[PDB]
Amino acid sequence: MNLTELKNTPVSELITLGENMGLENLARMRKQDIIFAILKQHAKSGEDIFGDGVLEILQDGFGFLRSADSSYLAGPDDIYVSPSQIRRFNLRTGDTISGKIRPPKEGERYFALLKVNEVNFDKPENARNKILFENLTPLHANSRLRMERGNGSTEDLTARVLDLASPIGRGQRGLIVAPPKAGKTMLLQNIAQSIAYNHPDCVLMVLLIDERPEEVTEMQRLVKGEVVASTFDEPASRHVQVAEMVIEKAKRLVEHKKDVIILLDSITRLARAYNTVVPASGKVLTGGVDANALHRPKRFFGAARNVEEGGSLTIIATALIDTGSKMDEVIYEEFKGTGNMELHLSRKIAEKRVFPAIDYNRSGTRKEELLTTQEELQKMWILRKIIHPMGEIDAMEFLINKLAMTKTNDDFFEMMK
Amino acid sequence: MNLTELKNTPVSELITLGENMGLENLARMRKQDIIFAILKQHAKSGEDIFGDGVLEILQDGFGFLRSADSSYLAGPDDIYVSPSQIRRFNLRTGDTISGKIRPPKEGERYFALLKVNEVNFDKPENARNKILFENLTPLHANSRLRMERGNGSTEDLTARVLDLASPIGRGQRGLIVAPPKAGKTMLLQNIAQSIAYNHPDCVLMVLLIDERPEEVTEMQRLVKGEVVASTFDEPASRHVQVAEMVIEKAKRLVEHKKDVIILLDSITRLARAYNTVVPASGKVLTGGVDANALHRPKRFFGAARNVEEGGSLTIIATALIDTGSKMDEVIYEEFKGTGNMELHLSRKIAEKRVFPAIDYNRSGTRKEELLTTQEELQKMWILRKIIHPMGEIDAMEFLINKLAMTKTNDDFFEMMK
Ligand SMILES: Nc1ncnc2c1ncn2[C@@H]1O[C@H](COP(=O)(O)OP(=O)(O)O)[C@@H](O)[C@H]1O
Ligand SMILES: Nc1ncnc2c1ncn2[C@@H]1O[C@H](COP(=O)(O)OP(=O)(O)O)[C@@H](O)[C@H]1O
Ligand code: BEF
Ligand code: BEF
Ligand SMILES: [Mg+2]
Ligand SMILES: [Mg+2]
Numbered sequence: 001m002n003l004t005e006l007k008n009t010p011v012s013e014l015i016t017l018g019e020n021m022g023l024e025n026l027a028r029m030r031k032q033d034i035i036f037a038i039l040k041q042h043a044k045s046g047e048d049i050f051g052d053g054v055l056e057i058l059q060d061g062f063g064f065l066r067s068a069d070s071s072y073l074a075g076p077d078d079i080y081v082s083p084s085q086i087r088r089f090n091l092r093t094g095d096t097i098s099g100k101i102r103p104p105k106e107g108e109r110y111f112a113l114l115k116v117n118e119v120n121f122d123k124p125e126n127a128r129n130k131i132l133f134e135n136l137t138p139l140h141a142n143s144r145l146r147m148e149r150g151n152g153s154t155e156d157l158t159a160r161v162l163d164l165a166s167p168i169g170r171g172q173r174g175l176i177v178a179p180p181k182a183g184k185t186m187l188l189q190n191i192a193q194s195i196a197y198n199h200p201d202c203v204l205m206v207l208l209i210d211e212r213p214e215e216v217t218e219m220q221r222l223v224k225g226e227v228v229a230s231t232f233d234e235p236a237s238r239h240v241q242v243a244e245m246v247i248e249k250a251k252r253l254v255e256h257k258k259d260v261i262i263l264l265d266s267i268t269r270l271a272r273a274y275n276t277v278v279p280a281s282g283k284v285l286t287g288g289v290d291a292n293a294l295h296r297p298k299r300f301f302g303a304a305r306n307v308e309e310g311g312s313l314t315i316i317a318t319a320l321i322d323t324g325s326k327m328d329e330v331i332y333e334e335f336k337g338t339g340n341m342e343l344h345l346s347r348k349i350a351e352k353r354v355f356p357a358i359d360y361n362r363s364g365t366r367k368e369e370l371l372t373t374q375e376e377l378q379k380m381w382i383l384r385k386i387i388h389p390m391g392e393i394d395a396m397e398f399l400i401n402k403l404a405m406t407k408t409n410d411d412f413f414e415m416m417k
Numbered sequence: 418m419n420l421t422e423l424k425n426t427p428v429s430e431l432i433t434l435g436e437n438m439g440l441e442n443l444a445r446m447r448k449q450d451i452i453f454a455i456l457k458q459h460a461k462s463g464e465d466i467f468g469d470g471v472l473e474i475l476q477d478g479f480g481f482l483r484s485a486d487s488s489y490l491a492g493p494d495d496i497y498v499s500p501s502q503i504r505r506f507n508l509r510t511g512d513t514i515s516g517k518i519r520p521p522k523e524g525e526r527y528f529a530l531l532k533v534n535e536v537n538f539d540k541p542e543n544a545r546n547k548i549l550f551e552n553l554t555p556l557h558a559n560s561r562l563r564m565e566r567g568n569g570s571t572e573d574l575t576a577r578v579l580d581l582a583s584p585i586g587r588g589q590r591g592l593i594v595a596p597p598k599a600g601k602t603m604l605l606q607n608i609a610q611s612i613a614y615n616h617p618d619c620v621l622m623v624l625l626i627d628e629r630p631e632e633v634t635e636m637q638r639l640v641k642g643e644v645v646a647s648t649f650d651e652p653a654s655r656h657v658q659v660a661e662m663v664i665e666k667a668k669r670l671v672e673h674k675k676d677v678i679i680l681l682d683s684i685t686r687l688a689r690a691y692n693t694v695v696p697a698s699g700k701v702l703t704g705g706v707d708a709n710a711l712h713r714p715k716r717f718f719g720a721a722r723n724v725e726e727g728g729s730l731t732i733i734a735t736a737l738i739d740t741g742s743k744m745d746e747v748i749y750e751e752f753k754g755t756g757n758m759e760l761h762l763s764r765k766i767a768e769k770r771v772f773p774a775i776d777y778n779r780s781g782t783r784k785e786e787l788l789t790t791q792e793e794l795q796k797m798w799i800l801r802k803i804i805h806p807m808g809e810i811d812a813m814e815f816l817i818n819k820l821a822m823t824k825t826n827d828d829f830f831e832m833m834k
Contacts, residue, residue, distance in 0.1 A: 028546065180754035181783070212590070212757075214555025214722050232719045233551065276708050280700045288702025324750015326703045351778065352805060353798060 001042060003051040003077065003101075006035045007069060014038065032077055040103045051079050051111060052098035054249055055091055062086075064110070065097060071228050072245045073238070080110040089116065089124065094248030096120050120256055131309070133251040138305040141169030143312070144371045145202075147194045152407040158190045158356045160409055161399065164380065165363040166343050168314070169371045170259060171306025174341030175267075176318035177332065182345045183357055184318050185215065188265060189222060191316070195261060196224040202259040207246055209239045209266035209273065236273035240296075243270055247303055250313055257310030267317035271297045271331045287326035294334055301338055322347070341365050349393055360387055360395055379413040386416075418459060420468040420494065420518075423452045424486060431455065449494055457520045468496050468528060469515035471666055472508055479503075481527070482514060488645050489662045490655070497527040506533065506541065511665030513537050537673055548726070550668040555722040558586030560729070561788045562619075564611045569824040575607045575773045577826055578816065581797065582780040583760050585731070586788045587676060588723025591758030592684075593735035594749070599762045600774055601735050602632065605682060606639060608733070612678060613641040619676040624663055626656045626683035626690065653690035657713075660687055664720055667730055674727030684734035688714045688748040704743035711751055718755060739764070757783045766810055777804055777812055796830040803833075 006014070014034045018026040021041045026034045039049055053065025054072065063086065064078035079101050085091070099116040119127040145168050149156040168174065178184050188206075195204055204225035208216055216229040230242050250260045264270075275293035283291055304315035317339070319332045336342070342363065349357035369377055387395045406412055423431070431451045435443040438458045443451045456466055470482025471489065480503065481495035496518050502508070516533040536544040562585050566573040585591065595601050605623075612621055621642035625633055633646040647659050667677045681687075692710035700708055721732035734756075736749040753759070759780065766774035786794055804812045823829055 181757075181759065181781070185783075212555065212719055212722070214557060214588075217554045218557070232715055280698055282699065284700055284702070286703070288700075288706070288708065290700075320754055323754045324752075325747050351781070353801060 001039070001047065001049045003035075003053075003067075004069075006038065007067070032075065036077060036103075043103050049101050049103070049111075050099070050117075051101040052096065053079060054245060055081060055093060055095045055097055056245060057081075057086065057091070057093045063091075063093070065113075066245065068226060068228065071230055072242055076109070078110055080108075080112050082113070085113060085116070089119070090128065092248075092252070094245070094250075094252035095127070096249075096252070120252060122256060127256075130255055133255050136254075136305070136307045136309060139171070139308050140367050140370055141172050141306055142370060143170040145169050145172075145195075145199060145314075147191070147198065148409070149194060149197060150408070155190060157400065157403055158187065159194045160403055161356060161358055161360075162191070162343070164383065164399075164409060165358060165360050166341055166365045167368060167371045168316075168341075168365075169306075170312035170314060171304065172314050172316070172341060173301065173304040173339055174316050174343065174365075175335065175339030176316060176343050176345075177321055177336075178318065178345035179322040179347045180320065182347055182350045183355060184265070184345070187345075187356060188263060188318065189219070192219075192223040192225070192263060199259075200224075202261050203253060204261050204263070205246060205250065206263045207243070207266070209242065210269040211266065236276045239270065239273040240277055243300060247300055251303065254307060254311045254313050257307075259311055260313050262304070262313070262315045264315060264317040267297065267301070267335065268320040268323075268328050268331055270300070271335075272327070275327070285330070287330040289327055289330050289334075294331070297331075297335075298338075301335065340367075346392055349396055352393060354393065354396055354400070358396070359392060360384075360399070361392065379416070383413070383416065418456070418464065418466045420452075420470075420484075421486075423455065424484070449492065453494060453520075460520050466518050466520070466528075467516070467534075468518040469513065470496060471662060472498060472510060472512045472514055473662060474498075474503065474508070474510045480508075480510070482530075483662065485643060485645065488647055489659055493526070495527055497525075497529050499530070502530060502533070506536070507545065509665075509669070511662070511667075511669035512544070513666075513669070537669060539673060544673075547672055550672050553671075553722070553724045553726060556588070556725050557784050557787055558589050558723055559787060560587040562586050562589075562612075562616060562731075564608070564615065565826070566611060566614060567825070572607060574817065574820055575604065576611045577820055578773060578775055578777075579608070579760070581800065581816075581826060582775060582777050583758055583782045584785060584788045585733075585758075585782075586723075587729035587731060588721065589731050589733070589758060590718065590721040590756050591733050591760065591782075592752065592756045593733060593760050593762075594738055594753075595735065595762035596739040596764045597737065599764055599767045600772060601682070601762070604762075604773060605680060605735065606636070609636075609640040609642070609680060612680075616676075617641075619678050620670060621678050621680070622663060622667065623680045624660070624683070626659065627686040628683065653693045656687065656690040657694055660717060664717055668720065671724060671728045671730050674724075676728055677730050679721070679730070679732045681732060681734040684714065684718070684752065685737040685740075685745050685749050687717070688752075689744070692744070692748075702747070704747040706744055706747050706751075711748070714752075715755070718752065763809055766813055769810060771810065771813055771817070775813070776809060777801075777816070778809065796833070800830070800833065 011031050014031060015026045018034050018038055021038065023037050023041060043049055053067050055063050056066050057063040061083035063081040066072040067075060097116055098118040100114045101111040102114060104110055147159045147168060148163050149159055192206060206219060206223060206227050208219060208229035210232045211229060213231045216231060220227040228242060228246055230239050250262060253260050271294060274296045275290050278290050278293045285291060301315060304313045306312045319335060320328050321332050344359035344362040346357050346359045390398065402412055428448050431448060432443045435451050435455055438455065440454050440458060460466055470484050472480050473483050474480040478500035480498040483489040484492060514533055515535040517531045518528040519531060521527055564576040564585060565580050566576055609623060623636060623640060623644050625636060625646035627649045628646060630648045633648060637644040645659060645663055647656050667679060670677050688711060691713045692707050695707050695710045702708060718732060721730045723729045736752060737745050738749050761776035761779040763774050763776045807815065819829055
């Protein structure tokens, strides 16, 4: 008796099971209400019920166990968590809790937690003694997260160009700067697919705030990982809540020496949401940005770091420029002094239908020698010195024509000499 | 005895009928008052009266049935809908209701609804069980909505250029960016005529907010569809109300697997209206735009989506640029990074009296391979690569001179090779 197991079951089988259990007509009923009635009827027989979810401690002291399939939205099937148990096990926002639950009695509206069985997918004896995320020693990117497929596919050209322009390692904090209508969607899809193919052990999390739902359901059915999104039909409060829950879960996972990867596509939208939810202080800067509005996105971005004791946190955010709004322009670069990695995309190259439209000149990675060998770094330096004199479109055409001849970049580097 | 039937009748016949029924002199009376008196006299004999309209639920709990011929304006002949029936049939704003009505008794001012016969042009048993619009899975444009006439007319050149620049499919969410005095009116008229000619099965709705009455009555007598407009003589409150009613009706139609097409021509004017009706919060951004003013137009624009279960919603809005106001430059923009189709028009080409004055270079459609075949996409790519080096005016002249030689674009593509 698990909550996620009943959530994954279809509607027809749940209706059939409820009709066999002998309850009210479930055809004219919601799936969540059907599951609730089935759990009630199964607990009336004396059997136990189990559930799971991410903890969201409220300001009063209690909390609930949000579900991932609903993008951490407030649902009727949330499991209550009393503050007594929180105080007894030192629980915090983001801790994954899995234990026995019971249906609400007369006068209650949510399931109660009796005994916790597993904390953060581990024993509670290992979670009671742990080092906080704020005390971990940061470090630079040491492990190399190669994005090249290696299967010789035609779509691998984007990953090869990305590796030649800006290699990505564990704990990297980069930025994907690109004007609208440049190809950010396809680039993010390719990055997510390459991460899921090359490094399936890492925890991939794609955050899409204030996006077109069709794109949400497309990304959810395309990438092999977790997708937490919030369409534009929701207020900025839900955006802030989802961002907080995601970053808290990422911190709790990193605290257990896990490799978390967050592919953010709405850093600008997140900053707009934070500027909308912040109370007015009577002081407005140039472009309509509050003085204390960028602090929360600043911390959300700076949360990414590489841990020496174990694990890492990678955050790749895509910033929006040339959107016609001065607020986004002020945000983007305020954040430019940030992202230890900038991958610029050119609109002029995208208009020529030359995919990918990557600005190789302004791209780059700091401390790239820690992720590449000596000969590889020398070859990349020679390639950059050869590409720099040529124009952007000409350099992109040259790179595409030279990478189409071979499958691996090593052969291209060997033929360049 | 139908309301719309009496509304379509002329004034002279209604006056004659009222004089034959033996009532007060109807020559010095309004047509609506004449219809009201005729309905009263016909109901005094014991016969039944029927009406219809779009439901507009008020904040208190009751509602009225607005009429389409009055642009959903508050009229004396609105049918009152009690909240009891709303609670009994789960009615919402936008549901088309058609049932028996009765004249108001002593102390009443509006017609009452006794029994509902048809809901959303369908049986109530099919409307009681339905999936909300917020739960439908979005998708990209799959079905091709070809705009080419095919009759070899001289006006078909605009549709041919539009198809070669940006093909339109079901569920598309585009933008027509053009400075003033460019030819937006003729272009919108041609688009509406091509939609009514090629795809007469789709529900066409043209929304004109804050425009001149002459243009309104011109569009109403030119296109073959529904025209809901609101001239500048009305406050922004009526603009917001009309936009809400139109989008709610569109959502209710899409919920019944219908293909709705909305040709918006005032996205900038709608954003200005929303910025005017929003209460001041003491925080003004660059250009005079409120922080929470663009949220409602953002949702109105993002409502457009393609449904996998059935139906679609297409919204083609025309944004205004270079109007001398910085608010529109932020308002029209901020919207640039939202849609997935931009059809730019050049003022320099319009000054040369070269119609249509379309910027073929900056135009385009994302995921265009889902609406065109392989050979068609290759021919469009070759045409774009040939047109790109030439200047805007030169490319437009070349395209016009090459399309004037033949009737179909297939012959032009075959002759280009
Ligand atoms: N690698 C690519 N190959 C082919 N087309 C692409 C590629 N990247 C982008 N595009 C085209 O650009 C359009 C928009 O790209 P997108 O990633 O949505 O840009 P952004 O996210 O910056 O708005 C897509 O619909 C696609 O047709
Ligand atoms: N396809 C066309 N053919 C001929 N003239 C046009 C065409 N499109 C626009 N025009 C001219 O431009 C004028 C204004 O066009 P309009 O569509 O009103 O531009 P906008 O809507 O951008 O203000 C029209 O009065 C018309 O004379
Ligand atoms: F319009 Be893109 F997604 F920035
Ligand atoms: F003056 Be146009 F209608 F933008
Ligand atoms: Mg995008
Ligand atoms: Mg116009």
